[PDB]
């Protein structure tokens, strides 16, 4: 029954920064609150228990505070190994419940995506399906929006995307978005357009092609 919330959902910070994350329980849990760190492909690790007790071996730059419903995790001077997702968990009562996580990623200057478009291959089209790909390359921050348009008509429900992990050299993200239609539909329309919206762009950018060129 006890719902756990976290804010912000994500934070951008630099090495040396002080970072504070908050957790909230839907009712009072006294000090029965734990914090965990998780990195990609790895198990959670315990940092803080009893709201403010530091787990043995955990660096003293991590610290927790709060009691009742409102709680704080503070990383006082962030190190490269601290970029990760942080989760809270109420340890008060069944069912044990976790907050949704706060991702701390690497701050750099804003970088607009380079936007490229790829029509479907000859090979694929013969086999009866058409995949159109839109690449958003080397951008920051993470937040971005792709919209697909086909003869200027907006599309919904027929596209999928994924995003790379933040690049260890340049701290950017890349994103791939795939539009999938049958060969029958694909050959009805002409203009396939990817329209991208992002902080680094002063207005949304469109890349497109004409089927059969």
């Amino acid at each position: 029954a006890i719902r756990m919330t976290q804010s912000p959902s994500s934070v951008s910070a630099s090495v040396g920064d002080r970072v504070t994350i908050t957790c909230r329980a839907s009712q009072s849990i006294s000090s029965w609150l734990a914090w965990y760190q998780q990195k990609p492909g790895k198990a959670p690790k315990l940092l803080i228990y009893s709201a403010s007790s530091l787990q043995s071996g955990v660096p003293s730059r991590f610290s927790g505070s709060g009691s009742g419903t409102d709680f704080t995790l503070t990383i006082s001077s962030l190190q490269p190994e601290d970029f990760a997702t942080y989760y809270c968990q109420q340890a008060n009562s069944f069912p044990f419940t976790f907050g949704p996580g706060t991702k701390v990623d690497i701050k750099r200057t804003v970088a607009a995506p380079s936007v490229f478009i790829f029509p479907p291959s000859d090979e694929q089209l013969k086999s009866g399906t058409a995949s159109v790909v839109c690449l958003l390359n080397n951008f920051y921050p993470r937040e971005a929006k792709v919209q697909w348009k086909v003869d200027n008509a907006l599309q919904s429900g027929n596209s999928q995307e994924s995003v790379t992990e933040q690049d260890s050299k340049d701290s950017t993200y890349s994103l791939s978005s795939t539009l999938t239609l049958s060969k029958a539909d694909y050959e009805k329309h002409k203009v396939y357009a990817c329209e991208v919206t992002h902080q680094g762009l002063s207005s949304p950018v469109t890349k497109s092609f004409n089927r059969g060129e």
Binding site: A43, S50, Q89, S114, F116, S121, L135
Partner: protein, 230 residues
Amino acid sequence: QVQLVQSGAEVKKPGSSVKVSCRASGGTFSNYVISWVRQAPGQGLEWMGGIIPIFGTAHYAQKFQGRVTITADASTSTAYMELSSLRSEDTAVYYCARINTSPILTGYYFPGVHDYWGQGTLVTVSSASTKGPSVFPLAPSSKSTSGGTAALGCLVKDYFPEPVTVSWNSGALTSGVHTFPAVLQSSGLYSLSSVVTVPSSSLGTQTYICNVNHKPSNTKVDKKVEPKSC
């Protein structure tokens, strides 16, 4: 001493059950609760239940009651989690973890601090059978160039299970490559793209090949990527 070592990855059909093991160090087994927590891909953490291994006493989250059985065996120092009537919804990494009730002396469950975790066991639930990918070119064009460089790639489509590996020109080309995380399509098969940016002048002379391996099906596809008239 403290170690929680879990069994290997599983692929199951809808309707079947899976039984995951968590082998523990003797002191951990003897003194503490072993809790189970799962995490669906891209998602948060969800408590399933826990057990007092020396007694076999099990408490389950309401959500899983009727489908989950947690057991333990002292002669192997191991805890087991069995989830029945699996669905695609149950695709997740399944963790075992030790609950440590410090600073409280009495009782096994509260406070429910999970102080050590196993490595996780991925369970993928899907009706699909093993299948190698179809690999399509993502052709460089005048619509994939910025300044003096061109983007090109490979679409690695309709394979099961994860993973595939993609290299470029048999490994000689690493710089500026982005191989994206696979998405699960509505068909139950994965799909992935891999892209690379290169100098546009090279597209005259330099051929680019993606090398796609899918170990589960013993398949390998080398796909030559060629410019398009677009």
